[PDB]
Design a protein around this nucleic acid. Structure first.
Ligand SMILES: [Mg+2]
Ligand SMILES: [Mg+2]
Ligand SMILES: [Mg+2]
Ligand SMILES: [Mg+2]
Ligand SMILES: [Mg+2]
Ligand SMILES: [Mg+2]
Ligand SMILES: [Mg+2]
Ligand SMILES: [Mg+2]
Lengths: 100, 151, 99, 79, 127, 206, 114
RNA sequence: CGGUCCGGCCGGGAACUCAAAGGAGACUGCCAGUGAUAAACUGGAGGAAGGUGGGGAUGACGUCAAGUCAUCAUGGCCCUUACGACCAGGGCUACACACGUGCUACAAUGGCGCAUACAAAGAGAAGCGACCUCGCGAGAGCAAGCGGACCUCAUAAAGUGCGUCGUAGUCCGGAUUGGAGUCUGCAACUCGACUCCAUGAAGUCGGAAUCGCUAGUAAUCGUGGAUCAGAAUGCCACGGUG
């Protein structure tokens, strides 16, 4: 992927742990408590003022070397092409071609 | 079947009367790999056929089968651009397999309330030789006697 | 009470060789040793497209076999505890100590 | 469509609706907020809702309450 | 001592125990009729007790795990025959002829890449 | 047609892994990127130091890098002068403490990666590809190789139409899993593009 | 037999006979027979005039037949005069719920013409 | 076997099922026929397995200047206060049509209601989430266990038993649309999935033409996974009947 597209992801990770990990979660659980504040909360309104990129759902899983947003595998943090390349060199531990 | 010369798979006999011929029949009727519901239709048809024809459940099947059983059939062959129908004498094993297949197919094409009723009334029509299944042996006969010169 | 050792490794001829070390070290230094118990292997399978672009039917199929070994040592003798603690095991074998 | 736990509205547009009530009806309100739910405090106003290129002015009626602002601004040109 | 024989077919695994006297059949603490709702599945377990005579001659305590109706019924059939040879060993000749000694190695074939099933290939289009 | 990777297909049969560590789904991705990042640093730094293979194992919360090299003296330096500066930044990249081992490559003309990199470095010096290939084959065969195959792909000698040329001597049974086949790649970044070098060395069965 | 909306339910079982009314499906028909104290597997024969009027009073609670028909039509016409996306699609005889129009939209479009 | 809350549940037992490391076994080896006394084939014995036992991986020299400069890398060229870069809204989802691949059907070998027997293989801590409680329901609140042969996803469905419908555009089929909701997510108008109530299209088995599959296969029936906040009739994988 593009250098700018890779940079856009770093910003999306940095903002995700800054807000929506220790602050925005507190106002979302608060916007769910039925026992306290049923009309006057403003928490749904104050969640909007927070940066858009701060949401973890806005982050895209990309190949950690190439930046590829498609064909990703969470187990290796890589795309199918770079998974295969590392697999054939024996750089992925315990991984080999399987048959059954 | 070009080089490899294979035989035939010997199937287990009928769980009711120990007949291998009935086991071929239940399998021919069988659809979607539902053997339990396939023998249920064959036995209910045989129970309603023997009762309404004077017992002998195995023999009442054989009377209906003797009428649908073909003697000769045509084989499609292209010699010199033209398609010639060569009449060939059918083997005793396939004689029964075609007879059973046409009974099941003619009962499927019927308009009765159930498959057990459709099968029973098809076997009743075959025993007296006046149905869709006996006409399939009749059409096969007229086709063979026509191309009798190319035998 | 009892000392439970759970062993994990991607190589089988490395897990039961490092398990052989634990079983022998404990039974020699005088301790009641249950096992080596061979628990089920967790086979994580992965299917990846082999071509950089198009060619859907052309694929590579891999697996990671996670071998499981259970070593239960009944007698927690000081001669056994100290012998097992200062043991040099294969770097690719994970050891879980359960009290 | 959405969970009954609070209808959605953008704060920037909500403050624009409040400013239009007290100061009186002005020219079309230029907003890109197509996701916002129409509230009763909008009936009578002219909200210029974006379609991707232009701001479609929509005269807010009592029956438009509950619906989204983007329902009255066609996004695709078909002839 | 109990005469034992292991039997298996497909993903099913059956254990068969033989003790003389009566014609009792107990499958997973349940009756033969109570466990199998099909009479065809009931007859295949009765098959080893045809060539080798039994009406009220010997009892059988059986347990089966995995597979299905015919898988479990097929597994027990193989187990009884293995528990019958455990009791005599001269019964082999009668058991071979019927084909009950043979473990049916037919397992369900794996789904292959680019194929709809194990062999079923997706529909071909020329143009 | 297309051939299976000779190293990949032999993993577990007759060929070892270059990464032997164990990790759960949790840190497996993080460890794999750290492995790439450490290999990248060392390959760049020890480029002239003839590095053939890099082995990475993780004993508990540590990193044990084994640099297989045909020139250990340049890798080690003046009484550990160069090992210390490498270990210091490997520990920085990995996070966990670092330990570097140096394995000697005896006969480098029998090492696929060192033969491939030799042909690649030669092509970049403007050496004739046929000469570079013939020398690689001759050197391996005289030193006891049971067989060798060397391929050179793309714009050979600066030619407009790219060609794939190969030299083979001895036995190269690529279908025998039992066969010790050492396979590796290298890319020659020439003034007229990229030239790919593929080397196969048969060392005997079992 | 004659219940609420002029229609004449057949001499079939009670639950399926009541589904003949526009506005009463499987759930409403089951709820109507449970509130009136009538069995579901009983026909129109034996069901006297004293049992019919108690079902008529029960079915009268929800908007059925012509009363429901105009209620559905009014909500469609409301969207249309409103000028919303939903109304523009009821006006253009194309799928309202977001479904694809590139292919397969034949229920709303009607049979194709070259 | 000892003890019963009749649950392997607790002492125990290492028998068995199973788990997973090592090992044996099948080679036309034996017998017979055919065959140039050869190769080989055919049949039979023994055997769990018989003639490469079943399935997979494995794809020679080469062919199509075949596909990929948009995974990545890279020669040359081109933009470089723009072909770069940031943002909001929109589009990739448009709809007279045509073709390819699929799903669901047209039903009594079936629909529905109740009762009920038998799987395999996977996934899981920013996670799988029991039990309890509330809601017709999608769900919600409360809150155990489990980094897992222990806990959870998770009730397998076909099937079987009984009852009903009785060849009807139907108790078949579910499209489309109206009303009300649930959840994920800053946010479900364009353009999410699912539920409740109502609606009940076409379709009664498909012209010319055409495809897959040789055995645990086809056919049919459920189950799980990768990607993934959410979004499978696709894909990958699993067993049941057969
Ligand atoms: Mg780049
Ligand atoms: Mg996403
Ligand atoms: Mg109705
Ligand atoms: Mg073994
Ligand atoms: Mg081979
Ligand atoms: Mg071209
Ligand atoms: Mg229905
Ligand atoms: Mg074949």
């Amino acid at each position: 992927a593009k250098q700018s597209m890779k940079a856009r992801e770093v910003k999306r990770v940095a903002l995700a742990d800054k807000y929506f990990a220790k602050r925005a979660e507190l106002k979302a659980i608060i916007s769910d408590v039925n026992a306290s504040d049923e009309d006057r909360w403003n928490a749904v309104l104050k969640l909007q003022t927070l940066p858009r990129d701060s949401s973890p759902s806005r982050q895209r899983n990309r190949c950690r070397q190439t930046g590829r947003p498609h064909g990703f595998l969470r187990k290796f943090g890589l795309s199918r092409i770079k998974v295969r390349e590392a697999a054939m060199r024996g750089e992925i531990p315990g991984l080999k071609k399987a048959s059954w | 079947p070009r080089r490899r010369v294979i035989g035939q798979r010997k199937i287990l006999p009928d769980p009711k009367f120990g007949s291998e011929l009935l086991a071929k029949f239940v399998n021919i009727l069988m659809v979607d790999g539902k053997k339990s519901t396939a023998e249920s239709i064959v036995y209910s048809a045989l129970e309603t056929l023997a009762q309404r024809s004077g017992k002998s459940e195995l023999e009442a099947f054989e009377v209906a089968l003797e009428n649908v059983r073909p003697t000769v059939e045509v084989k499609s062959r292209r010699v010199g651009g033209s398609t010639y129908q060569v009449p060939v004498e059918v083997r005793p094993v396939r004689r029964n397999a075609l007879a059973m297949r046409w009974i099941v197919e003619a009962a499927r094409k019927r308009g009765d309330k159930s498959m057990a009723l459709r099968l029973a009334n098809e076997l009743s029509d075959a025993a007296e030789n006046k149905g869709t299944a006996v006409k399939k042996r009749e059409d096969v006969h007229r086709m063979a006697e026509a191309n009798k010169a190319f035998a | 009470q009892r000392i439970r050792i759970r062993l994990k490794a991607f190589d089988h001829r490395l897990i039961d060789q490092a398990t052989a070390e634990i079983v022998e070290t404990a039974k020699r230094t005088g301790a009641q040793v249950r096992g080596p118990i061979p628990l089920p292997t967790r086979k994580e399978r992965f299917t990846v497209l082999i071509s950089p672009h198009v060619n859907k039917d052309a694929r590579d199929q891999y697996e990671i076999r996670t071998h499981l070994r259970l070593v239960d040592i009944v007698e927690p003798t000081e001669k056994t505890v100290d012998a097992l603690m200062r043991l040099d095991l294969a770097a690719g074998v994970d050891v879980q100590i359960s009290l | 469509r959405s969970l009954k736990k609070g209808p959605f509205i953008d704060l920037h547009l909500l403050k624009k609706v409040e400013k239009a009530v007290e100061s009186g009806d002005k020219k079309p309100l230029r907003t890109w907020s197509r996701r916002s739910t129409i509230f009763p405090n909008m009936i009578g106003l002219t909200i210029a809702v974006h379609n991707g290129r232009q701001h479609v002015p929509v005269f807010v009626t009592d029956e438009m309450v509950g619906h989204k602002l983007g329902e009255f601004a066609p996004t695709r040109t078909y002839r | 001592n109990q005469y034992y024989g292991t039997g298996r077919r497909k993903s099913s695994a059956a254990r068969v125990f033989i003790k003389p006297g009566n014609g009792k059949i107990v499958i997973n603490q349940r009756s033969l009729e109570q466990y199998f709702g099909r009479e065809t599945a009931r007859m295949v377990v009765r098959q080893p007790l045809e060539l080798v005579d039994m009406v009220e001659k010997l009892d059988l305590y059986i347990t089966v795990k995995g597979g299905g109706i015919s898988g479990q019924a097929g597994a027990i059939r193989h187990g009884i025959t293995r528990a019958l040879m455990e009791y005599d060993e001269s019964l082999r000749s009668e058991l071979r002829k019927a084909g009950f000694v043979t473990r049916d190695a037919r397992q369900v074939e794996r789904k292959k890449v680019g194929l709809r099933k194990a062999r079923r290939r997706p529909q071909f289009s020329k143009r | 047609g297309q051939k299976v990777h000779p190293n990949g297909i032999r993993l577990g049969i007759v060929k070892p892994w270059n990464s032997t560590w164990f990790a759960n789904t949790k840190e497996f991705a993080d460890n794999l990127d750290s492995d790439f990042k450490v290999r990248q640093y060392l390959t760049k730094e020890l480029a002239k130091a003839s590095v053939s293979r890099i082995v990475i194992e993780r004993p508990a919360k540590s990193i044990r890098v084994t640099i297989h090299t045909a020139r250990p003296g340049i890798v080690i330096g003046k009484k550990g002068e160069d090992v210390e500066k490498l270990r210091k930044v490997v520990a920085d990249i990995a996070g966990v403490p670092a330990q570097i081992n140096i394995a000697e490559v005896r006969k480098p003309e029998l090492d696929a990666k060192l033969v491939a990199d030799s042909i690649t470095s030669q092509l970049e010096r403007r050496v004739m590809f046929r000469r570079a290939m013939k020398r690689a084959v001759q050197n391996a065969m005289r030193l006891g190789a049971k067989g060798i195959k060397v391929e050179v792909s793309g714009r050979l000698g600066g030619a407009e139409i790219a060609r794939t040329e190969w030299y083979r001597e001895g036995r190269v049974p690529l279908h025998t899993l039992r066969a010790d086949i050492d396979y590796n790649t290298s890319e020659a970044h020439t003034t007229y593009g990229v030239i790919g070098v593929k080397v196969w060395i048969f060392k005997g069965e079992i | 037999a004659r219940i609420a909306g002029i229609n004449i339910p057949d001499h079939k079982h009670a639950v399926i006979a009541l589904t003949s009314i526009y506005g009463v499906g499987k759930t409403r028909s089951k709820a109507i027979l449970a509130a009136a104290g009538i069995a579901e597997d009983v026909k129109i024969s034996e069901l006297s005039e004293g049992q019919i009027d108690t079902l008529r009073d029960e079915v009268a609670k929800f908007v059925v037949e012509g009363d429901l028909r105009r209620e559905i039509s009014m909500s469609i016409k409301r969207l249309m005069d409103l000028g919303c996306y939903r109304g523009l699609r009821h006006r253009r005889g194309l799928p309202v719920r977001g479904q694809r129009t590139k292919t397969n939209a034949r229920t709303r479009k009607g049979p194709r013409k070259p």
